[PDB]
Structure formats: C-alpha cells, structure tokens
Design a protein around this ligand. Structure first.
Ligand SMILES: O=c1ccn([C@@H]2O[C@H](COP(=O)(O)OP(=O)(O)O)[C@@H](O)[C@H]2O)c(=O)[nH]1
Ligand SMILES: [Mg+2]
Length: 482
C-alpha cells in the first residue's frame, strides 16, 4: 500500500519501510523525502546512519521523521527526549524505494516512465532520452546530469530531486537511470536493480549491455546478467528495449512477462546502424557526418535512445532534432584537439577499452598512441582483464604505441595504483608481446607522448579517475586549446 495525501501515522510509515518506530506514535504532516542538510519542516529524512548531532539538527529543522539503519551513540534516547521520531530499518534501500513510489504517486502519477540500466552506456542513454524529450518541450525528470548520477537506493536522492521538480512542473516523463550492479562498501547489494525498477513501475526498460566490471562485487559475467536482468523481470507492462548485439541482453527477452513487448535494436533490427548511418525501418535516419568523430558506444547508445523514444511514440522527426542537438557527458570519447587528434575517453573495463581503441583506430590516419592509466585500488583482476582487452584489441593493429601510467601525481588515496596492480597490468602486456613505455606520473606520460607524436597521429587517452585530470594537465603544458 502507498498512501495519497500529506499526512501519515508514524507507525504506518514504519510499516511501509519495514522499520520499527522509536518514540510515541502520532499523525504527522509530510513534506517530501529529503536529506538532513536540505530538510524543510515536515520532511522525512532517510540517512543510513545518524548521530546525536543529526538528531538535534532534525529537531531544529522540524523534520517529521528520521529513517535510519544505524543510530550511533545515544541517538535513540536523545531523539525520544527531543520527540524526534526515529524509524529503525535493517535495509535502507526499502525506505528509499518506498520514497520513490510515494513521491511518484503523490507528485507525478500521470507520467510515462523509462528505466535505463546496463554496465556501459546507461548514463549516456538516459541523458540522450532526457534531452530528446526536453528539447521537444516536454516536461521531464531525470536523475543523471553532467555532474551527478543518483542511480541507487542507498539514499533518498531520487525521491528528493523528483519531488523538488514535480512541485514546480507538471511532469510528463520520468527518465531514470538504475544501477545494475551496486555495492554497499565491498558487498554486492543483491536485487538492487529489481527493487529500484519496481519502485518506478516503468513503461519501458532499456538495457544497454552486460559486461564485466565491478570485480569483487561480482566475479562472472553470468552474475552481471542475473543482477541486470532484475530490471527486466520488474517490468510488468510496456516494452523491453534490448541490445540485440550483446548476447546477455539478448538472453533477457526470454525473461519478459506476458504483456511486455520486446524491442530489439542492433544488427538486422528495425533500429540499426549500417553503411555509416543509422536506419529506422530501412530509412536512412542519421547520416555519417551528422555523427562526426563518434564512438561505437555513442552509436549504440543512440540506437537505444531512438528505440526507447519510439516505444514512447515520439515522432521520428522530433527524435532526430534531439539527437542532432545532443551534448555528451564528460570524457565520453571527447575530442580535445584535431592536430594531433586527441581523444579523451573514460574507458575502464574490458568492453569499454576495446570499444575506445577500435573507434579511435577508425579515425586514425598514421600512428595511434594509446595512453592508459591503471585503475588504482580496484584490484588485480580488473586491471589484468583490462590489460588483456587492450592487448588483444591492439595486436592486429598496425603502427601503434602504448604508454601506461600510474598517475601517481594526480590521483587521491582511494585511487592509488597498488604494486600488485601495476605488476599484473604490465605483466599481461608482456604476456601478449605488447611493447610499452611506463611512467609513474600522468604528466610525464602526456609530455613525452605529445613531444614524440606527429600532427597526423591520434592520441587516445583512456582511464577512469587516473585519466580524469588529463585535460587540465593538457592545458597546463599548453597543448590545449590547440
Ligand atoms: O539496504 C541495504 C542493503 C544492503 N546493505 C549491506 O549490503 C549487504 C548486501 O545485502 P544483500 O541485499 O545483497 O543481502 P544480505 O547480505 O542482507 O543477505 C548487506 O548484508 C548489508 O551489509 C545495507 O547495509 N543496506
Ligand atoms: Mg559511453
């Protein structure tokens, strides 16, 4: 049960989120689900831990109820004395899921809804779909922008941001990115994608792909498939928009409920890419030079976004206007320079690395330089898998040079390369007979590459946090703005 209205009983709220009420029961007025730092009077705050200071601030802000997993110190007795209701839960994700359900019901019930998930591409696809809709003058909400990606049930950010926009606009579309494989510290939050998708009750679920990543949370691509498939099992109506070219997203068609139509995109599909262009129902839709200097992933995400919008009955001409005006997210195959061609891509797992190298080689006239930052403090296995992907993708390619770096000079302590991580990465390159140069510092790797390259070469920069600072370093050494 999900109530309608601006009042609840504290014991009812506790029941809705699977918690126990600490304090005296009472009818409360409710504002929105919020963070403690932004809370307005009568808001409900979900925060997986609290302490006595948080209780005092909640009292000062007239928060209606605090929902938490871990009341530190004397928080419980203090809150009882202050009459700050505490609802104690064991899994905060259920409270955050209820907050989404309740916020949709009370603030944006008359909406078409898309959930987008997948290992790579889900933020870009979400961003593209959102852009197509708002560029068309539709009122829409999304949980991802150029600066943030609030795609979990760990906190109430989705419910809060949705409520804040729904109070100002008559929303027609919700475009929600859902984390398919989500960690709580070092532990996989099993069924997260199912729970979060079910909380949204979407009309369309988009699954971009299934790929190895988040090693430690998962070990096998089968596990990624199982967790990601939760979003498709959650779908009770409408359309499953599935990548036909990925074998595991293809497998998800068998998992759809009876009243769900599968909509495949990819090779030999109604929405497809071929002969340098994107085709819809065999009509040339987006042309080659309307997609300049673009990645394979950029194309596949566009196919996904087209397919999602077609399932929402957006007219093709409006879809096209959106695509041609789309502004991509940071370090998504970003063209930093044209002479030499410098490409800055956040590739960070085997599929993304292979995609980035092949797409860069497609655009390369003479020599291809690949500058790659090891993925610090993410474990030996992911760095071994990544070096393996880099090596297998390049071994057939002619006229390349590999430059590996630890980026010791720019990463923070949570992203430092460990000795065992550098070792497995470099030893894998050698195993595949890939010649390479290595530099502890990103800055030296960039300076040496730009010095030795020719104006006809291509420089591809790949890496997550280890390569994030590269563009500002490139301006400092006066390579950019070229
Ligand atoms: O809302 C949640 C969900 C998960 N966890 C943590 O993440 C682990 C993974 O939880 P999961 O749902 O996979 O299953 P469980 O471990 O409870 O059997 C849990 O044991 C907790 O340590 C948590 O603290 N809050
Ligand atoms: Mg991408």
């Amino acid at each position: 049960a999900t109530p309608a209205g601006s009042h609840m009983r504290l014991s009812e709220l506790a029941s809705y989120v699977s918690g126990k009420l600490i304090g005296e029961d009472k009818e409360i007025k409710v504002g929105i689900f919020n963070t403690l730092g932004d809370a307005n009077p009568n808001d409900i705050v979900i925060r997986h831990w609290i302490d006595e200071k948080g209780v005092e601030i909640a009292k000062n802000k007239e928060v209606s109820a605090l929902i938490t997993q871990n009341p530190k110190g004397n928080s419980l007795e203090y809150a009882k004395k202050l009459k700050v209701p505490i609802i104690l839960v064991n899994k905060i994700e259920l409270a955050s899921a209820f907050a989404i359900k309740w916020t949709i019901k009370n603030f944006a019930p008359n909406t078409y809804r898309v959930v987008i998930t997948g290992t790579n591409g889900k933020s870009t696809t979400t961003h593209m779909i959102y852009h197509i809709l708002t560029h068309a003058g539709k009122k829409a909400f999304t949980n991802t922008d150029a600066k943030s990606e609030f795609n979990t049930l760990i906190d109430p950010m989705v419910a809060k941001l949705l409520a804040e926009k729904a109070k100002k606009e008559n929303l027609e579309y919700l475009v929600i990115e859902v984390s398919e494989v989500q960690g709580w510290l070092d532990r996989l939050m099993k069924d997260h994608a199912y729970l979060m998708t079910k909380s949204i009750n979407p009309n369309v679920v988009v699954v971009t792909n299934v790929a190895l990543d988040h090693i430690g949370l998962v070990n096998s691509i089968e596990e990624v498939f199982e967790e990601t498939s939760g979003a498709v099992k959650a779908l009770e109506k409408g359309f499953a928009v599935l990548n036909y070219d990925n074998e595991f997203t293809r497998k998800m068609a068998k998992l759809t409920n009876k009243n769900v139509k599968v909509f495949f995109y990819g090779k030999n599909c109604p929405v497809t890419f071929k002969s340098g262009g994107i085709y819809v129902n065999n009509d040339l839709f987006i042309k080659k030079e309307e997609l300049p200097f673009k990645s394979e992933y950029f194309i596949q995400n566009t196919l996904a976004a087209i397919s999602a919008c077609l399932c929402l009955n957006i007219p093709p001409d409006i879809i096209k206007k959106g695509i041609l005006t789309y502004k991509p997210l940071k370090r998504r195959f970003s063209i930093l320079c044209k002479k030499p061609l410098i490409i800055d891509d956040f590739a960070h797992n085997p599929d993304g690395i292979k995609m980035a190298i092949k797409s860069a080689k497609k655009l390369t006239k003479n020599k291809l330089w690949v500058v790659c930052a090891i993925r610090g403090s993410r474990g030996k296995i992911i760095n071994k898998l990544n070096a393996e992907s880099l090596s297998k993708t390049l071994k057939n390619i002619e006229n390349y040079e590999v430059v590996i770096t630890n980026s010791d000079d720019v990463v923070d302590n949570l992203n430092k390369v460990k000795k065992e991580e550098e070792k497995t990465f470099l030893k894998t390159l050698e195993k595949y007979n890939i010649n390479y140069r290595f530099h502890k510092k990103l800055k030296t790797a960039l300076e040496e590459t730009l010095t030795n390259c020719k104006k006809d070469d291509t420089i591809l920069l790949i890496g997550a946090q280890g390569m994030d600072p590269a563009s500002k370093l490139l301006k400092k050494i006066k390579v950019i703005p070229c």
